[PDB]
Each structure stands twice: as structure tokens, then as C-alpha cells.
Amino acid sequence: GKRALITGIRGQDGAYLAKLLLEKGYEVYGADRASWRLKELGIENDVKIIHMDLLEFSNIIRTIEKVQPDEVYNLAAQSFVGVSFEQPILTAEVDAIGVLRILEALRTVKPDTKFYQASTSEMFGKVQEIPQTEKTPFYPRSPYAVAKLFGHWITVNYREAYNMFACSGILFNHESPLRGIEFVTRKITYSLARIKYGLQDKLVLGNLNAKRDWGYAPEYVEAMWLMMQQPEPDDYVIATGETHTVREFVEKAAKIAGFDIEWVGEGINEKGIDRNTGKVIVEVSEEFFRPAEVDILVGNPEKAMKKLGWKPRTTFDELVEIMMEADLKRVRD
Amino acid sequence: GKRALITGIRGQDGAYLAKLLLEKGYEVYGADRRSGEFASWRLKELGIENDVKIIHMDLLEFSNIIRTIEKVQPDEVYNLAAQSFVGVSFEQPILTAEVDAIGVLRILEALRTVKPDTKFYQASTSEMFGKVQEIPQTEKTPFYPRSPYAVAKLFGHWITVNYREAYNMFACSGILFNHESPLRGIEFVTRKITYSLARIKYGLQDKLVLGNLNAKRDWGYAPEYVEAMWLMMQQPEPDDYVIATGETHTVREFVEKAAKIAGFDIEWVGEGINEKGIDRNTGKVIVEVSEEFFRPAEVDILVGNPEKAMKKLGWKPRTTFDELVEIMMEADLKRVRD
Amino acid sequence: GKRALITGIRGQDGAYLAKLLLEKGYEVYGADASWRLKELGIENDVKIIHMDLLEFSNIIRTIEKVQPDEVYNLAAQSFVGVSFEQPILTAEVDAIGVLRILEALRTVKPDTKFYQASTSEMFGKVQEIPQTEKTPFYPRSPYAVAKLFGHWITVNYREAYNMFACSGILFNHESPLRGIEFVTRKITYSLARIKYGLQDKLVLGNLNAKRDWGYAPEYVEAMWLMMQQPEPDDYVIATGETHTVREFVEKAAKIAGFDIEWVGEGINEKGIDRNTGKVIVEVSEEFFRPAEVDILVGNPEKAMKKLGWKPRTTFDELVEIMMEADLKRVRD
Amino acid sequence: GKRALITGIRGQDGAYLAKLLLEKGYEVYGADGEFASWRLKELGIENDVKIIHMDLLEFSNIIRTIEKVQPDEVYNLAAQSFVGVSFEQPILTAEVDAIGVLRILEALRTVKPDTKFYQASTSEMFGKVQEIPQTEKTPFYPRSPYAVAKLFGHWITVNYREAYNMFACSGILFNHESPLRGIEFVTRKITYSLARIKYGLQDKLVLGNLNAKRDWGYAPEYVEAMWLMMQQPEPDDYVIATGETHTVREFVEKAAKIAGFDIEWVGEGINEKGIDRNTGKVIVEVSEEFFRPAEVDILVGNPEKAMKKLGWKPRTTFDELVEIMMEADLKR
Ligand SMILES: NC(=O)C1=CN([C@@H]2O[C@H](COP(=O)(O)OP(=O)(O)OC[C@H]3O[C@@H](n4cnc5c(N)ncnc54)[C@H](OP(=O)(O)O)[C@@H]3O)[C@@H](O)[C@H]2O)C=CC1
Ligand SMILES: Nc1nc2c(ncn2[C@@H]2O[C@H](COP(=O)(O)OP(=O)(O)O)[C@@H](O)[C@H]2O)c(=O)[nH]1
């Protein structure tokens, strides 16, 4: 029975990771500064919530002293790229300096602690190779990305300089029913469900050609745990290795939702018609439609599949189905 | 008339940059954390102490930085400050990040808000290459920091790039390799060597204790490097440049050439950590390697390829390694003769 | 409609201040759902925004974006006990946090009116009885020490940059919005339940503890009054009189149908309802602390003279407002 | 042998304390440049003091230091001690002179509680004096971010004594100069100036308020007081001053004499000018440029308690001091 400490406990990954660790018999302490996610997973009463703020050092030190964890998963952050352009300094304090604060607190009070840093594919920014691996040169394109890159390297440096068990997971996009409404995958499934129940009329999106490497969040936090259970600390890219367009997602979700969508038109004037009603379910707005991105983010996780035995167990279709089902259920109630 | 704001004004680079811009008709405002009665010594030694306006601006106080930009309204800002000590960064990692990484973003953000048309130069370092991924290293060599200082600087470099690409601000990042001068700080091997030999020749000192005499370094002449900073800032489009000599020399060579200039015919008797420098001239021991500094042969060779600087800025090393060693040794022999 | 910014919006004071400011035509921005805002019916009228007192830049942009005319710093890590365990964190919010706001205003909008929420805790080892603005401070906890910094840095920004910065030294104030962890709500809320079977007995601490208790709505009004004066100044906001935890339990119990008779002493004191001859109130070693030697009571006359402020609710009415309110809640 | 850890080792008081403690057989460890240790060199102890890197802002760094040094006595003499800079960098000043004190205390509490601790408090905390002279009992009234931050360091030190039972002292020292005094302060300015004005390396001397009555003492004697109170059976706070005041004007007069000058104070106000009644050449001007935001007029302390309990008292005379400083600079 080990003790794990999860920052960002209220988010998609913290929630699912909490679930996973509890099933493996851990005592789970969620760092926070009630959560609808822990509750939806039915574990809000088994997750021990304690205070901790990555913005200040002394409270982190004391939290480690009191909790004495075996494993610390830092999934906490200001993860919105957009916001980071407006609040770059605050973003840096949490996503960059905050990472160091924990490492320095573990170095100072409990050096035998395992540390996982939640890195992102956003660090590859203007991709230097396709697909991307642990050896692909980084090229951040937003304050958020630059702060994350800092967190990455500072985690590698503490591993090399103090021989601490510090891992860095360079994770690519991963969704789930607990995904924020702010995200395209959830927006699509949430919206479609509502439309099917008259609570909404049309699904308004951006470029339907945008491509992403989408995975199933539960399987991703599992890779986090896997990294942490190895004899030697290392960093891994975690992704599916394939990309899909926003159109494939809408299209497949609309299908599961019962619609018989049939695209027509192109560009900003694209539309999806439900051949079951004859009305337009989806349409593109200039408000969202942005320039087709030449840089393609898709990771090559063979290193993780190799050393960790990790591998996606959900196909893109299964993921789309899971999310659409969950949201068809949510809207009914 | 143009006006420049230089952080770390009282340091080696800041002092030379100030001297250079003053010669170009610039109005020079500066700021340095190190104050006191001997702090502006580099400014006194170059004779520009009364030609530089010193203001208070700490890289950790955002409101102070903002007020400074508002009041000074600079045309060019050169961020040359920093707690530039690799060693100390392990003992003060967060403070190091707050100054060398976030301090960069504080200046940029106050510039974007107060006077967005201000040119900005960030003093990045070859330390960001750390475990060199390519030999030599160019602007394209993947970075691999090996210390909180290197990692912070990496943030400082990228945040600078991002502001150039995202806000179309004129922001430059100069990746400079070691550059020495008589103004270099005693802490560095170069001043340590010359300042020590000078004290040895004049009997004020016993011996010179160093680390591995095989350590290779790409040493350049400071005055030429700050000139490269000004060059970058005068280009139509901002960019980043590797500024180095492109060739290395061993700490041993530096001691030898320097020893002579001081009146010593050094002969190297020993192996590695047992190596010793005996002046045939008097059969006495001048140099010995203490295990206190020694470090096994480094597999990583830090050597920069400044060909891009040559092509766009028309910049290249002019002073020679022998001229550099000589310039430094003479400056300290002179300092000791007082 | 003037624009106001309130840190600590979800707390008792923040909730009541926002209601007072809204009735007066203000645009209210609250820095941080909250059951209090919803209970006052102003949840949809308070514009919620983000602001963290532990970091400086986010505060700057918030001021540059809201351009508030009045700022009320009611946010804080206000737990003496917890402050002994987290002294540094406490200082960063209750001491440096105040300076971060003031420094933001000074840098971006100097004509902004600023109110700092100080506490009688700064009198700690009371140097006079009662305590006034002229009473020497003597903080007895990291919390009180931090708040003291908050008070003085506020005085210094007024005198150095000539800013309209006020500091109100407020004593205890209660209301139906007080948290259950506080003695007064615990009393009324408990009695209500006991009256409807939901609970068995009320377990308190030293029933001899004496306190200067006021009505929160009147205290946040003094805050606003301070901010409307010609000149900025500091004021002690209190009732000037005190009562024991016993008087409170008793008066409330009488509103809850009980008829308490006190038997026992110190840690062995117990209250009995004659009407039903049963032990309702009892003291336990868990909540028992010796009778504070530092008698905390404020003389609010300066507030009368310059603000024309004074308590307008009796201790009895305060107990009634709370007891009645929690009886209604328990029913529904 | 006794082991002491001093912060601000290269500062004025830090250097003298190092000298004195070495003289008493202590192992000295100091935390804090190519000429930075110029003070240690001047007192020729530069090689008897072990230097370690510890910054008042890096808590983890402070902990490792106590852990590595295991000091018996800790004297915190480091600080961003510039009332002026204080207004330009109020947050940084607080983090170092206020929270910085707390980080040490907290590091001592958890790594080595039995360590004696000394906080370098200051008379600047009395600001707009509430009594004349000022004693340990004179209510404080800070007039700058520096003063306010220090006030926190004082109270936080007191609280760690009273609450955690630690040996924590707070020395409320009044202004004290020496030849090592920083060139930023008025005293070292005047003497460093005249050794120039009257040497053709400068014209005149521009000063601000030539009326600020100041209690001036001799640095070496004041650091003696620190060691003394730290040696008492019980920790406590003490006021350390000469109990005698002299205006900046009065200081210049004598300070100039030791170089050849006969004041001719002509003109009251910003138009005040002091000419040499000898070579008939004006050598002293004025300018609002040197008038502080919230100035502290009179400052005179009553070191009566230090006398009774520590036996401490000022020896060097005001003139002896002016002489000491004026000569070391004439020489330089
Ligand atoms: N989702 C993805 O597809 C990918 C995510 N990641 C990264 O993985 C991590 C977890 O992902 P996910 O759950 O979706 O992200 P979230 O955005 O949900 O995680 C943010 C969490 O951080 C907490 N938090 C914010 N500031 C602080 C602070 N100062 N101190 C402590 N906690 C704080 C938040 O709490 P509160 O609610 O109180 O603000 C919230 O629970 C993030 O760091 C993200 O950047 C990387 C690659 C892909
Ligand atoms: N620094 C400084 N202080 C001056 C000057 N002229 C007058 N003063 C006053 O001298 C007094 C003492 O100044 P200083 O030695 O710097 O000490 P401090 O006031 O304790 O920081 C203050 O009240 C100043 O306002 C001047 O030119 N420089």
C-alpha cells in the first residue's frame, strides 16, 4: 500500500489517475488550492484532499512532510495556450517554476520520492520531425509551451544531477467523457447530444480539416503509472501515432448519435446534413475557422510500447463512441 | 539621439557595451544588482562612469521594471544581468529561474505593454548546449541544459523567440560562448590564471592551483562580442546568433602563454592530477592541480560555429588567442604593480 | 454605477458588501459557486473573475482590465491556528498580498480607493482596555503579525504616495452567513437541529469566553463609509461591549423553545432545558481553552465622530436574527 | 569552540561582528564580488571567515545551510537596507527584510531549535516617533516599506520567542556609522565627499534635509551589544543608541573642519548654502532631490535597559566618530 500525491486532482487526468491508483490499492492524496469528476467516477470519498499551491514554496515543503508520499504526479497547471498569451508570467510561475518547487521540496524533505512531470506535445510546437519522438528537437510556440519545456528540462536535470527518480511524460492529446467542454472533442459530442434533444440547433466549429493525435485518457494515465514502476527513470512520448480530422470525429459521433450526416459544401461554408431530417446539424463559423496548420503533431510512442509494454487498447472509433454515448446519457438527465 | 538600457551595466559585457554605444553617440542608462563603493570599478577603469545614468531596476520587481521602461523610454534594451553562476544555481535553483528565466519575460511583457517598439537583446549562453548534440554547435544544434542556470537561460532564450514570433517584437537572442577580457571576474579561470601569476611574479602569492589542465575552451575577446550584440540589433529583421571564435584551447595553453608574459619558463612535470608546473627559470613550482577542482576528461566539446554571424552581421573574431592572453596578463601585471 | 473589486467574495463579508454595493448601483467584481451569493440572491449580479494574491502579475492585469474605482481586500488565510503551521504561506497572503494589490494600483491606477481588512487580532496582548486606533499593537501569532504588516503597508501607501488607502480594524461580527465552524453558527445551527431531533446535544468550549460580537451587514457598511470620506483614515469597528459564549447559547436556546439552567463549572459545565429536564449543552476537553487574559473589546467612537457609524442592532437582536434564521433552515 | 553564522557578512555590521567574534575565539561563518570583501580585508579577517552561499529568498537554501553549518548563534544582519530603494522595490524589500527573517526562524525551528537567534531590527521602525526619547515601549510607526518590513521581522522574532520558546532576540539599533559605513548613507557620503572636494576631485556637497536630528553611534560598539544580549540567560529585546542627537548640519561642520573649512550657513530652506569662511568658496548646497517621501524627523533612543541588563553603554563620542570616519576617507 503506497501513498501517491496528485496535483491537478480535479482535472481529467488527476481524476482517472486517482481511480487507477485506488484500484491498485494506493492511498490517494489529491492536491488542491467538491469535484464533479471524482464524483462521476464515484471516488470523491476515497480521495484524500489536501491543500497545496504551486505558486508558493513553503506550503509545498510542508505538504510533502505531512503526506510523505512514495509517488508524486504533477498533473497541475494552467493548460490553456490562449490564456498563456494573456497571463504568460502567471503561467510560467505554475507550469515552469512550480515544477521546480516540487522537485526542490522533494530534494529537501524526501529525496526517495518518485516524481512524474506532465509534459506536452505542445513543446514540439513547430515540429522539427514527423512523427515526433523523444529525440525530436523542441520548438515551443506559446508562453505555455515554453513554460512546459522548462518543467521538462528541470525534471531531467534533477534526475541527472541528484539521481532522483524523476520522469517526464511528453503526452499528446487525450480525451474522455471527463474532458472539458472547452475542448473540441467534448464540444462535438456534448453539442450533438443536445441537438438530438432540441436543447440546441446547430454545432458550430472551425476548420474541419484540423488534424490531431487523439488518445483515450484512462490509458494515458496508465502509461504515467507504468513509467513510475520501472527500475530506472526516463521520459516517454505517449500517443497513438495516427491523426484524424475534426470532420472524422464529428461525422463518426453524429453517426453514433443516430444522425445520418452527409457533408456538402467546402471551406468556411461546409455543412453536415442529417439525411434523416434534412436540416443542417453542423456548420463552420469564421469565429472558429483558422488557417490550416502546416505543422502536424503526431507522436511515435514505440519507445513506450517497447520498454513499458504500453499500448492504446481503444481504437479511434471506440473513443468516439465512448464520448458520444456518455454525452447522450448526460443530456437525457 | 538613441537611448539604450543595459541590465548588468557594471559587469564585463555591460561596461564594454556602454563604452561602445557611448562612442556611437548613444544615451546610456544602466542597472546592476551589485552596488557599493567598488562596484562601478569597470566603469571607472574604462572612464565612462560619469557618462552612464545609473537607475534602480531589479529583474524580480515587475512594477519597478514597468516604471523604468515608462520613465526611460528606451530604443534598445540589452538584458546582460543574471546570477550567471552554474555552481550556485544548484544551491539556489528557484532564485536562478526567477532572475534568468522569468526576469526575461518581465522585461518583454513590460515592453509589450509600455513601449512595444523597443528592440530587445537577451544574453543567452553556450551553456544551453550543455551535453553538446553536434560538434561544432550552431543556432540549429538541439539544446541540452545540465544545470538550473542552463535550463533557466533556455527559457529566457525561447520566451524571447516566442515574443519575436508571436508579437512581432524586435527581440534577439545571442548565444555567446566564453569571452574574456581584463574586466572578466576573478572567479573565471582566465582572470584566476593571470591575476595569480601576477601575484606570484611579485611574490604576493605562492602557487596557482587549477583543475584539469586539459579542459578545452572556446575563448573570445569580450569587446568584440558586445559589438556583435549591437550588430544584431541593427539588422532589418531580428534573429538569434551564435557568437564564438570557433576554435578551442586548453587551460594549459592559457597558463603557458600567460606564464611567459609574466617571466616564467614553465615546464610541465606530471600526469593529470599529478601534473605540476615548474619554472626552469628558477626551478620553483608555480602550478599544481588540486583534486578540489579537477574534473575527468569532458566528453562534451563546447565549440561554436559563428559562420551565420559572419554572413548576416559580417562579424568574426579579430583578436587572436595570443593577443587575448597577452592583453589580460599585461592588465593584471599592471594592476599588481600598484 | 461605480466599479468595485472584492477579494474574498465568497465569504460572509464579501457576500454582504456585494449586496450593499449592488443596491447602490455599483458594478461588482469578485475575485476568487458560493452558497452565500446565492442565498442573498446576487449570484447572477456579481461578475466573478480570477485573481491570486500569491502572484503579482495576475493582479496587475486584473486592475488594468477592471479599472475599479474601489478595491476591498477582504480575502485572507485568517486562521490563527493554521498560521502557526503555515506561517510563511500566511504572510504571503495576509501580508505581502496586501502590498501586491497596493503596488499594482500605485503602478497602474493610483486614484483607486483601497480598503484593507484588518482585525482586532493585531491587539493580541491588549495594551489597553478597551482598544482604540491609538492602542499599541502586540500580535501573538504569525497571522496577527502578517495582518499588522498589511495594516502598516496600507498606512504607508496613503502617506507616501498620497493614495486613498483605508484600514478598518474590525472586531468579531456575525450573521446567518457565518460558517458552521464558528461558535455563533455552531450554536444556533446546533440548537435548531436538537429542537427537531436531527441532533442530540451541543458540545462547546469554555462557556466563560467573553466576546465583542456585532452584526456583519453593519460592519461591511462601515467599510463602504470609510471609503466615501473626504480623507482616508483608519477606524476601529466594534460594538464596545462583550458577552460570554454562555449568554449567546442561552439567549438563542430561549428562542428555540428551550429553557436552559446552568449546572457545573469550567470543563464540567452543562445546560439543562427545564421544559424537558434534559442536558442540551455540554463542554468538552477538545474545545476547552482557559479564559483569555487579553480582554478584546473595541471603542468605536472615532467611527461615530467621522463616519457617523455605530452598532444599530442589539446583541439580543443579533442572537435572534441568527437563531430564527437557522430554525427556518432546519425546518425547510 | 563557539560557532556563529552571520548574514550580511560583507556589510558594515557584519564585518565588525566577525572581527569581535573571532577575537572571542568563535568559528565564524558568513553568507552573502571582486572587491566585495573589501571590509573583511580592511579589518584583516578575510581569511578567518568561512563564506557560504545562502540567500534570504531561497528557503531550501537556508535549510541546507543550517544543516551544513550547525551554528550555535545566528546573527541576521543582511538586508535590502535602503529606505530610498525601499519605495522603488517594496515587494522585494518585504520578501528579504520581513519574510526572510521568518524563513531563518522556521529553518531553525525544524533543523536546530536550540540555536540562538538575533534579528537586526532598527530605530526606523519608530518612524514618526510617539515618544521622545524612544524606548522598547515606544509604539512603532513605520514610514517606509523598509520600516514596515523590519517591523514584521521584529514581531515575528518576538512571536517565535513567546510561542515556540526559542532564544530569539531583536536588537532595535539606532543609526550607527563607521569607516566601513556604506557610501550611500549621509555620514559616509559627507566624509567620502570632503576627501574629494578639498582634493580637487569634486566641487561642492549637495544635501537634502539639513535638519534631520540623528542619534549617531559607533558601529563596533553596537555589534558588541548584539553579542551581549545573545549571551544573556534569557532572550529579550533591547534599544541600542547613544541617547544623544545631532543634526546633519552639525555633522558636516565638524567633518569639514578636519579637512579645512569654516561654515557660513547663509539662507534658510532649499536656498540654504554653506560657504567656507576662509577661501571664500561655497562648499555646500541643497536640493529637493534628496527629500524623502515619508521622512523621519527626530530619532533619539534611551539605551537605559541595555545599560541595566547588559552593562552596555556608548563610549566613542560624537566628535571621536566624525574624526574616525573623516580620516579613513581623507586617506583613501
Ligand atoms: N489534456 C491533454 O490532452 C493534455 C494534457 N497535458 C498536461 O497534463 C496535465 C493534466 O491534464 P488535464 O487534467 O487535462 O489538465 P487540467 O487543465 O484539468 O489540469 C489543471 C489542474 O491544475 C490545478 N491547478 C492550477 N493552478 C494550480 C496551482 N497553482 N497549484 C495547484 N494546482 C493548480 C487546477 O485546479 P483548479 O481547478 O483549482 O484551478 C486543475 O485541477 C496538465 O498539466 C496539462 O498541461 C499534456 C499534454 C496533453
Ligand atoms: N542619503 C542621504 N540622506 C540625506 C541627505 N541629506 C539629508 N539626508 C537625511 O539624512 C538622514 C539620514 O540618512 P541616512 O544616513 O541615509 O540613513 P537612514 O535615514 O536611516 O536610511 C535622513 O533623514 C535623510 O533624509 C543626502 O544627501 N543623502
Residue D50: beta bridge partners?
A: D29
Residue D73: beta bridge partners?
A: D4, D116
Cis peptide before B136 (omega within 30 of 0): yes
The distance from CA A118 to its chain's CA centroid, rounded to whole angstroms, is: 9
Same domain, B6 and B138: yes
Q: Cell numbers of C82, please?
A: 493554521
**Of D98, D149, D155, which is closest to C139 when you measure between CB atoms?**
D155
CA of B223 to the centre of ligand 1 (A): 47
Tell me the three state secondary structure of residue B250. Answer: strand
Distance CA A271, CA A262 (A): 8
**Of D58, D64, D88, which is closest to B95 when you measure between CB atoms?**
D58
Q: Which ligand 1 atom lies nearest to the CA of residue A15?
A: 13
Same domain, B163 and B262: no
Distance CA C169, CA C133 (A): 8
Give chain B's contact residues with A (Cβ, < 8 Å).
Answer: 62, 90, 93-94, 97-98, 101-102, 105-106, 109, 142-143, 145-148, 150-152, 154-155, 158-159, 162, 165-166
Binding-site residue numbers of D are 12-13, 32, 55-56, 77, 79, 81, 150, 175-176, 181, 184, 186, 189, 208, 214, 292, 295
Residue A115 in contact with residue A70, Cβ under 8 Å? no
Are D148 and C146 an interchain contact pair (Cβ–Cβ within 8 Å)?
no
Q: What separation in angstroms does the CA of B334 have from each of B194, B265, B329?
A: 11, 20, 8
Residue C117 in contact with residue C73, Cβ under 8 Å? yes
For residue C56, list chain B residues with Cβ-Cβ distance below 8 A: 62-63
For the question of residue B320 being annotated catalytic, the response is no
Same domain, A329 and A299: no
Chain C residue closest in CA terms to D293? C160
Domain count within chain B? 2
Residue B293 in contact with residue B230, Cβ under 8 Å? no
Distance from CA of D210 to the nearest CA of C (A): 21
Q: Cell numbers of A136, please?
A: 525530436
Strands (DSSP E) along chain C, which ranges?
3-7, 27-31, 47-49, 70-73, 113-119, 165-170, 173-174, 202-204, 210-211, 214-215, 234-237, 243-244, 260-263, 270-273, 278-283
Label the pairing between strands A280-284 and A271-274.
Answer: antiparallel
- Type of residue at C155: V
Considering every ligand atom, which ligand is closest to the CA of D284? 2
Q: How many CB atoms lie within 10 A of CB B26?
A: 19
Same domain, C136 and C222: yes
CA of D247 to the centre of ligand 2 (A): 11
Q: Which of C59, C88, C294, C125 is nearest to D152 (CA)?
A: C88
Distance from CA of D274 to the nearest CA of B (A): 25
Instruction: Give the CATH number of the domain where residue A94 resides.
Output: 3.40.50.720
Resolution of the structure, angstroms: 2.6
Residue B96 in contact with residue B148, Cβ under 8 Å? yes
Same domain, A154 and A280: no
Same domain, D193 and D239: no
Same domain, A88 and A152: yes
Distance CA C301, CA C246 (A): 27
Residue B24 in contact with residue B229, Cβ under 8 Å? no
Label the pairing between strands C243-244 and D116-122.
Answer: unpaired
The distance from CA B75 to its chain's CA centroid, rounded to whole angstroms, is: 23
Residue C32 in contact with residue C56, Cβ under 8 Å? no
Choosing from D29, D146, D192, D218, the catalytic residue is D146
Are B61 and D91 an interchain contact pair (Cβ–Cβ within 8 Å)?
yes
Task: Give the N- to C-terminal CA distance of chain A in Å, as an integer.
Answer: 38
B165-196 in b/e form (b: 16+ CB < 10 A) is: eeeebbbbbbbbbbbbbbbbeeeebbbbbbbb
CA of B169 to the centre of ligand 1 (A): 30
Same domain, D140 and D4: yes
Interhelix angle C97-108/B62-72, nearest 10 degrees = 10
What phi and psi values does residue D51 have, to the nearest 5 degrees?
-95, 135
CA of D292 to the centre of ligand 2 (A): 8
Q: Which of B318, B301, B319, B322 is nearest to B310 (CA)?
A: B318
Q: Which of B255, D103, B303, A265 is nearest to C87 (CA)?
A: D103
B82: left (phi > 0), else alpha (psi -120 to 50), else beta?
left
Which of the other chains make 3 or more beta carbon contacts under 8 angstroms with chain A?
B, C, D
Residue A148, annotated as binding a ligand:
yes
Are C99 and D90 an interchain contact pair (Cβ–Cβ within 8 Å)?
yes
Chain B residue closest in CA terms to C107? B63
Interhelix angle B102-114/B148-166, nearest 10 degrees = 20
Q: Dihedral of the CA atoms A265, A266, A267, A272 (nearest 10)?
A: 60
Distance CA D158, CA B272 (A): 56
Query: Ligand 1 pocket, A53 CB below 6 A?
Result: yes
- Type of residue at D88: E
Structure determined via: X-ray
Task: Give the N- to C-terminal CA distance of chain C in Å, as an integer.
Answer: 37
Label the pairing between strands B119-125 and B171-176.
Answer: parallel
Q: Which of C78, C152, C86, C156 is nearest to C119 (CA)?
A: C78
**Nearest protein Cα to ligand 1, atom 21:** A8
Tell me the three state secondary structure of residue C281. Answer: strand
Q: What separation in angstroms does the CA of C121 have from each of B302, C76, C296?
A: 60, 13, 9
Task: Look up cell 611579485; give the residue.
Answer: B202
Distance CA D169, CA B117 (A): 52
Residue B151: beta bridge partners?
A: none
Considering every ligand atom, which ligand is closest to the CA of A97? 1
> What DSSP element (H or E) covers D196?
helix D186-197
Same domain, B200 and B172: no
> What DSSP element (H or E) covers D265?
strand D265-266
D308: DSSP letter: I
Residue B59, annotated as binding a ligand:
yes
Residue D273 in contact with residue D204, Cβ under 8 Å? no
The CA-based angle D268-D274-D278, given to 5 degrees, is 140
Tell me the three state secondary structure of residue D269. Answer: coil
Residue C205, annotated as binding a ligand:
yes
Residues with CB under 6 Å of ligand 2 are D 83, 124, 175, 185-187, 189, 207-209, 212, 214, 248, 290, 292, 295-296
Task: Look up cell 530587445; give the residue.
Answer: B120
Residue A286, exposed/middle/buried by CB under 10 A (0-12, 13-18, 19+)? exposed
Q: Cell numbers of A19, please?
A: 481511480
Q: How many CB atoms lie within 10 A of CB D187?
A: 24
Chain A residue closest in CA terms to B107? A89
Same domain, A138 and A122: yes
Query: Ligand 1 pocket, A173 CB below 6 A?
Result: yes
Task: Look up cell 467542454; give the residue.
Answer: A181
Instruction: Give the CATH number of the domain where residue C271 resides.
Output: 3.90.25.10
Distance from CA of D281 to the nearest CA of A (A): 55
For the question of residue D247 being annotated catalytic, the response is no
C296: left (phi > 0), else alpha (psi -120 to 50), else beta?
beta
Same domain, C136 and C6: yes
For residue D38, list chain B residues with Cβ-Cβ distance below 8 A: 37-38
Distance CA A31, CA A48 (A): 9
Same domain, B64 and B147: yes
- Type of residue at C120: S
**Nearest protein Cα to ligand 2, atom 27:** D207
**Domain around A332:** 180-214+243-293+315-333
Tell me the three state secondary structure of residue D139. Answer: coil
- Type of residue at B272: G
Distance from CA of A158 to the nearest CA of C (A): 25
Q: Cell numbers of B93, please?
A: 535553483
Q: Cell numbers of B57, please?
A: 531596476
Q: Which of A172, A177, A251 is nearest to A208 (CA)?
A: A251
